[PDB]
Amino acid sequence: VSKANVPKIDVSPLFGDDQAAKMRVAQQIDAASRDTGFFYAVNHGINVQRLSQKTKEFHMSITPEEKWDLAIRAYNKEHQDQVRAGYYLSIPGKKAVESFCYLNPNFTPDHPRIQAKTPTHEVNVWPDETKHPGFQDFAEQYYWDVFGLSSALLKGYALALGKEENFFARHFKPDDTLASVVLIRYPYLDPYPEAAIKTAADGTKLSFEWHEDVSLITVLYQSNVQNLQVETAAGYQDIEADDTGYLINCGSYMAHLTNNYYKAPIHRVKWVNAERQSLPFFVNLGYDSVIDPFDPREPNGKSDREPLSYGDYLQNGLVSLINKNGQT
Ligand SMILES: [Fe+2]
């Protein structure tokens, strides 16, 4: 099994005002997006040491009582309004992974999309502050930190495609973004439950099957345990781990609006019996955001693809992924 070419790109010029340096970053984003579809963002300015430590303290401290109280509707029939946000329980002996998902901290009972009961908008649920001091403060702060990095990355993607730098970022707003953070724990278990291991067609043991992401882009921090593979025409290739950088890839909304010029790479998660963390940020736009598709391959950029509202795209995509790859 070969290793994927995943370049490390210094994204720090995207926070600055040297326009030529920004173009040089854009070229590297373009090149990576047209090859395997993955790159590492380095020199990003986020304290990922604190991110991993605070996430670890939470996963290891939370009790079954608290998990039921935070559980999404798939695990707790009483929580009909928690489809996305909350705790995704493991099932001892059956399901190893567990995770906590939260949404835009600005979605409050007072927020107009919450008042209108608009699908995919939810109010976050949090553990008790006395049992997990500082956890909510940390997590909300982290959302805005990775929002900022993601904004900058979106300027690079715009420039790479020949657009003005706010082409995507103008739709990525703190008041209405549907972006989510998921804090995923993959545990060490001995014996490891066989029901939690999937066998791929090629024989590889997996934790999560092939998929394209439901996102515009995905901005991922993982601890230093190799697990991801990306599909190429010549088969799956291993993505090397790097626990100082963020792993970036496009989701299927980018593939839609570029007429597949930037594909959403198909990837899967190998089974590895090791304690590790996977902390994705899914860059989603607003419910009513619409970007007119274009084809960068054509001089006039003409595309026949229908514009797709981000809210409709997200509603269909999240359900489809659950149906295909299982309730996480
Ligand atoms: Fe993914």
From Swiss-Prot:
Subcellular localization(s) per the UniProt record: Cytoplasm, Cytosol
Single annotated GO MF: iron ion binding
Occurrences of domain Fe2OG dioxygenase (ranges): 173-285
Cofactor: Fe(2+)
Binding site for N-[(5S)-5-amino-5-carboxypentanoyl]-L-cysteinyl-D-valine: R84, Y88, S180, Y186, H211, D213, S278
Keyword Cytoplasm set for record: yes
Database matches in InterPro entries: DIOX_N, IPNS-like_FE2OG_OXY, IPNS-like_sf, Isopenicillin-N_synth_CS, Oxoglu/Fe-dep_dioxygenase_dom
GO cellular component, one term: cytosol
Free-text cofactor note: Binds 1 Fe(2+) ion per subunit.
Principal subcellular localisation of the protein: cytoplasm
Residues annotated as binding isopenicillin N: R84, Y88, S180, Y186, S278
EC number, UniProt record: 1.21.3.1
Record text on subunit structure and interactions: Monomer.
Protein name, entry field: Isopenicillin N synthase
UniProt gene name: ipnA
